[PDB]
UniProtKB/Swiss-Prot annotation, chains A, B:
It is an enzyme of class 4 (lyase). It comes from Mediterraneibacter gnavus (strain ATCC 29149 / DSM 114966 / JCM 6515 / VPI C7-9) (Ruminococcus gnavus). Catalyzes the decarboxylation of tryptophan to tryptamine. Tryptamine is a neurotransmitter that induces the release of serotonin, which is suggested to modulate gastrointestinal motility. Therefore, the tryptophan decarboxylase from the gut bacteria Ruminococcus gnavus (strain ATCC 29149 / VPI C7-9) may influence host brain and behavior. Has weak activity with tyrosine and phenylalanine. This is Tryptophan decarboxylase. One of its GO terms (cellular component) is cytoplasm. It is found in: Cytoplasm. Its cofactor is pyridoxal 5'-phosphate.
Length: 462, 462
């Protein structure tokens, strides 16, 4: 039992892993972006049981490095063009290492008071960038889903009671992230009472159809209580009409929550900050640091304009008076604080702006290309496009684009996935890697066009 | 921008911290259990701003180590007799380092499939220990709070509709953790509809008064839908009558959820496993690994007997079909798996049993002591006791017990805090440190008795 907490075998394995991993960090370019697992790999894991007797440490570590951690998308590779695993700074890694070492937590007791002070300082700073100048509040959460549910609960407790909750209705767009409707169900709003407002050609929420749905629901006897606008859509990086939405909310006595899990980072970019004008109008906003603030999963934030709303929703005593929904938390904000102090907000701002440039470069490289359609132009480091030769009908065009995705993934040169946009299968690129160059974007596009016409000629008909 | 993700200054700072921390791990005994911060320390943190220009890494590192991380309760000290910060194995630390290094996540996408395979293997194994043999399900959560709300949301969707949700009532004891009632509010159950059933002298839920409240509420027109039994109360480690409660739930069509954030680990102890007979009767159960599975915050699990109930509450499409409430999660289960593989379940079991022995040793040392009352006997590594000389009245007895707590904390020899139990201030000991000895328990009690009569004689009246 004296070798449970600490042993020399462990102390060595830790130092060895850190050393080895730092060394392998310098040969990321030589490695494929995405390594895929074979179909027998799952059973290989399921056949390792939870043993009664312990195993030698480095034997288990090697097993995890080879059989578990190996099969992933390296988000720290410049040509990993997805954003769900975000590029993770080693400053953030260091934050995790220290926080886990000291074994401390946020909230809960008062044994670690400075932990909460650190997090509070960050949340205050983030409040400034959003546009909350009055008396804001906030809490660190594990992700956007948790950020969304936290805000929507505050929204619900602020607008509805237990006897009219069944009459409450919520409003989102068809490009709104799925966690929002999911979170709405959890707090008591049925899917039948969650309106999916259509979007522009620019994928922004149609505020005209929004108001129509609001007046109709109000007339039916329902109680419209919240509109969720997205600042940085998952698919296209589009932004809902923030001022227009806020106007309707003030008019119809509705809570305005902005889902800025991805796009809220743009506030740190002096060049593109103006795109999120009116975030300070919202009553609450979500923000993930593991997306565009270069953190490891998971470090996300939710901010409210009036802190009294978080108290009314999440206080412990006397249940009628950060917090919520957790009591004791992992010290998530500590690694973000460390990142801010070491890198500074200017540098982080510059990195975000480089993300915009990468998408633009992808579009500029796609323009001369023949039969390449731009479904969504370069917007907030994102771009959606497809190879659509006139010869192939609708169905075989979608299959073509999917085959292109598989072809480049197997090549291990870049990570590009397919998303359904406007009814058609579309290739998507989200480039936010700080060290990605124009050559990276150019060659990738050139490699995509190559695969595009390779599979094109493979359509031997009939 | 090329020094955001990685730099030599960072690679050195990482290797330096890990190396230095492992070295200081050999002098934990020489250090005080709790280091308390002065009243100027908060301002010392608030005066450091979020800089636009980056700071040198080790300057920031030293700052956090000295001004932030320094002020904490060392849970890895054998005489830290609280459990909220649990004793953290370095295997768990290693798990954190690896998980953060590879920058991977659970759920979400299909880029890291073996991560989910690993977590699922653990959850299946944990299901076996609870008694879910039919078709169970589960998801890793950030803590007990998240485990409770996940299960209670499942409870609600299974028993109530949107128009009678306001009529639903829940039933807990006066010893049930505060996160439970808080979570009930979040999913739509107001505090006025959360019944606090009184407890025995053994601090177990009175199943007789429970049925009375159920029949009364049923007659009033309310809809009793869930009872939350606790397997291992925060204060005394008491266990509610699991079979009695389950019987009532089957009879009255109610969901049975067990809060085993702390006590569910006892299932791993072959000696004391029988104390949790009937856990398999519940429809859901919570379980924290950062409490008695020697993990860092936060690593917790929630299990349900019927996985379909979790699907009905947390599915994404078509919202009428792990998961919930999160989509993408930190790979929390990976560090638990590493711990399980390295230490084995037998060794973990032995440590738990050693926790029991420590509490027993505290009681055995307290029996000969005069004027020391045992409010709660050694139960699940917990014991509650007080120094109550007949000379001092009720109020000054409580003040006495609080001063003893302060006296031993300032000495830095042990961490013992006060809890209110049966209306009176009481010293509480939770000893779960795998390397704590009988001398540790004996000297602690002897030191308390010393301080007890020291403050006693300081009551110079009148
Ligand atoms: C726009 C947006 N909102 C919310 C989320 C939260 O999703 P997740 O829980 O997977 O982090 C993400 C993803 C996102 O891109
Ligand atoms: C009995 C019990 N239930 C639930 C919890 C969850 O609390 P937390 O969110 O701080 O982990 C704990 C503490 C606990 O001891």
């Amino acid at each position: 039992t004296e070798y449970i907490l600490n042993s020399t075998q462990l102390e060595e394995a830790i130092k060895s892993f850190v050393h080895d991993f730092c060394a392998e960090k310098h040969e990321i370019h030589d490695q494929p972006v995405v390594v895929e697992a074979k179909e027998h790999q799952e059973d290989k894991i399921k056949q390792i049981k939870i043993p009664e007797k312990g195993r030698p440490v480095n034997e288990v570590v090697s097993e995890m490095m080879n059989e578990v951690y190996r099969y992933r998308g390296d988000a720290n590779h410049p040509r990993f063009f997805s954003f769900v695993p975000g590029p993770a700074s080693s400053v953030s890694w260091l934050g995790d290492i220290m926080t886990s070492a000291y074994n401390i937590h946020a909230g809960g007791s008062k044994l670690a008071p400075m932990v909460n002070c650190i997090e509070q300082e960050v949340l205050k700073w983030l409040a400034k960038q959003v546009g909350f100048t009055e008396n804001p509040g906030g809490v660190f959460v594990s992700g956007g889903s948790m950020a969304n549910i936290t805000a929507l609960t505050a929204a619900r407790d602020n607008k509805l009671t237990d006897i009219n909750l069944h009459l409450g209705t919520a409003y989102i767009s068809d490009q709104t992230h799925s966690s929002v409707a999911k979170g709405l169900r959890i707090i008591g709003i049925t899917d039948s009472r969650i309106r999916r407002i259509p979007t522009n050609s620019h994928f922004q929420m149609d505020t005209t159809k929004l108001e129509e749905a609001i007046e109709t629901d109000k007339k039916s006897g329902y109680i419209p209580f919240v509109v969720i606008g997205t600042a940085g859509t998952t698919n296209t990086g589009s932004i809902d009409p923030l001022t227009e939405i806020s106007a309707l909310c003030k008019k119809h006595d509705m809570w305005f929550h902005i889902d800025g899990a991805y796009g809220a980072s743009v506030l740190l970019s002096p060049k593109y900050k103006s795109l999120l004008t009116g975030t300070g109008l919202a009553d609450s906003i979500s923000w993930d640091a593991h997306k565009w603030l270069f953190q490891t999963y998971g470090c996300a934030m939710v901010l409210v304009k009036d802190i009294r709303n978080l108290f009314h929703s999440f206080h412990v005593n006397p249940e009628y008076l950060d917090i919520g929904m957790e009591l004791t938390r992992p010290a998530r904000g500590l690694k973000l604080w460390l990142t801010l102090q070491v890198l500074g907000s200017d540098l982080i701002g510059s990195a975000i702006e480089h993300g915009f440039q990468l998408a633009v470069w992808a579009e500029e490289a796609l323009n001369p290309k023949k039969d390449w359609e731009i479904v969504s132009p370069a917007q907030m480091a994102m771009i959606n496009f497809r190879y659509a030769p006139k010869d192939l009908t609708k169905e075989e065009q979608d299959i073509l684009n999917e085959k292109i995705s598989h072809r480049i993934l197997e090549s291990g040169y870049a990570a590009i996935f397919t998303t359904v946009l406007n009814g058609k299968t579309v290739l998507r690129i989200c480039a936010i890697h700080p060290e990605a160059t124009q050559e990276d974007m150019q060659h990738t596009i050139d490699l995509l066009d190559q695969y595009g016409r390779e599979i094109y000629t493979e359509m031997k008909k009939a």
